[PDB]
Amino acid sequence: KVFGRCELAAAMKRHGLDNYRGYSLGNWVCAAKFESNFNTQATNRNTDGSTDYGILQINSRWWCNDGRTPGSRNLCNIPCSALLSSDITASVNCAKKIVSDGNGMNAWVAWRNRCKGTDVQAWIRGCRL
């Protein structure tokens, strides 16, 4: 599923991300925009052989099991395929664990390089939230 911008904002809100570890909703939207273009089916292979999955490009090196990332963890205890669902609960729940682990949203390289230090409130302009 390819979410609309406001549609995604409202689902992320409902799922408890706005101000999660202090990151406002527009941070999470901006990150989803640049990580996946708001597409829950987005996958991209990393150089190391791990793969990033879903709307927030969660990595099989640490967070989920895809059975082809040798020498990896599954810290969210989920198959990576659960991260591709049109229902974003699994992605959200896992993103909570990632953002809590010490580096905040710097864990998302697109957030750091494309959202951090920018006007992210724009990402939620005109959404009925």
Active-site residues, by number, are 35, 52
Residues 110-129 as x/- pattern, contact with Na ion by CB under 5 A: --------------------
Binding to Na ion by residue 72, rule CB under 5 A?
yes
Q: Is 117 helix (H, G, I), strand (E, B) or coil?
A: coil
101 is in an annotated binding site: yes
C-beta closer to Na ion: residue 36 or 60: 60
Angle between helices 25-36 and 5-14 (to 10 degrees): 130
Binding to Na ion by residue 74, rule CB under 5 A?
yes
Binding to Na ion by residue 51, rule CB under 5 A?
no
Residue nearest to Na ion (CB): 72
C-beta closer to Na ion: residue 8 or 78: 78
Q: Is 45 helix (H, G, I), strand (E, B) or coil?
A: strand
Token readout for 98 is 């990632």
3-state SS record for 13-52: HHCCCCCECCECHHHHHHHHHHHHCCECCCEEECCCCCEE
C-beta closer to Na ion: residue 19 or 44: 44
Binding site for Na ion (CB under 5 A): 60, 65, 69, 72, 74
Binding site, annotated residues: 101
